[PDB]
């Protein structure tokens, strides 16, 4: 018999992104080649099958630094990290291949789906 | 020029609630009289003006235990904590006064608004 506040989940996510911008309570640095990205482990797990696996591991759960595969593109990661915190995906002709490869590695199925559909439409 | 995934914010919140149920990466215990509630500081801040103030404080940000005012009702807190993690508010005739008082203390304006409207309709 609950009532539901339609905008609540979006409002929570907006405030999680504000915390990220102000670097408040971030508990991990994701290293992608020469670049570093601070984030909240809980948000990374909630968005990515890869981080969900990493941070439920009894040893990796305690790491403050996670190094991604050297084949991962920093811009592609940056676009996906912004997506995690905003629901908005900056998908462009110049970045779509890197975004799709990064989303496959991060196990972000919905992003992979759409990248596949956008590529199929251009061929 | 971003695209947006409509269900993303709801999916993030659902996974944050799963983390809470499994007690994964919870970093605070909220003590309300004889009861204890484990939560994620980032979610509490994102939902509540009171926790936002508490956890941006340079000393309180590091506390693992937060004790609420003894006038706060544990059930009222439990209902609001569930709301924070789900967008669903279990508002009932028997709990509305406690929910509204707890939402005023926690500075959860949207919950306060609706409690006020539901009370006005019954008088």
């Amino acid at each position: 018999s609950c009532i539901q506040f339609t905008r609540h989940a979006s409002d929570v996510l907006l405030n999680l992104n504000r915390l990220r911008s102000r670097d408040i309570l971030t508990d991990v640095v994701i290293v992608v080649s020469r670049e570093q990205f601070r984030a909240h482990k809980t948000v990374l797990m909630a968005c990515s099958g890869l981080f969900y696996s990493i941070f439920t591991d009894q040893l990796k759960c305690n790491l403050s630094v996670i190094n991604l595969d050297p084949e991962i593109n920093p811009e592609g990661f940056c676009i996906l990290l912004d997506f995690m915190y905003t629901s908005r995906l900056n998908l462009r002709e110049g970045n779509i291949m890197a975004v799709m490869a990064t989303a496959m590695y991060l196990q972000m199925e919905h992003v992979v789906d759409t990248c596949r559909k956008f590529i199929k439409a251009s061929e | 020029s971003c695209i947006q995934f409509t269900r993303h914010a709801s999916d993030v919140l659902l996974n944050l609630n799963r983390l809470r149920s499994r007690d994964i990466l919870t970093d605070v215990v909220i003590v309300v009289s004889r009861e204890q509630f484990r939560a994620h500081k980032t979610v509490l801040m994102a939902c509540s003006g009171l926790f936002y103030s508490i956890f941006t404080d340079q000393l309180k940000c590091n506390l693992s235990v937060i004790n609420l005012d003894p006038e706060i009702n544990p059930e009222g807190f439990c209902i609001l904590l569930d709301f924070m993690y789900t967008s669903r508010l279990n508002l009932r005739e028997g709990n509305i006064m406690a929910v509204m008082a707890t939402a005023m203390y926690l500075q959860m304006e949207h919950v306060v608004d609706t409690c006020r409207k539901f009370i006005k309709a019954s008088e």
């Binding site: 609950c2 009532i3 539901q4 506040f5 339609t6 | 669903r88 508010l89 949207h110 609706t114």
Partner: peptide, 4 residues
């Protein structure tokens, strides 16, 4: 607020 809505009836979900």
């Amino acid at each position: 607020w809505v009836i979900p």
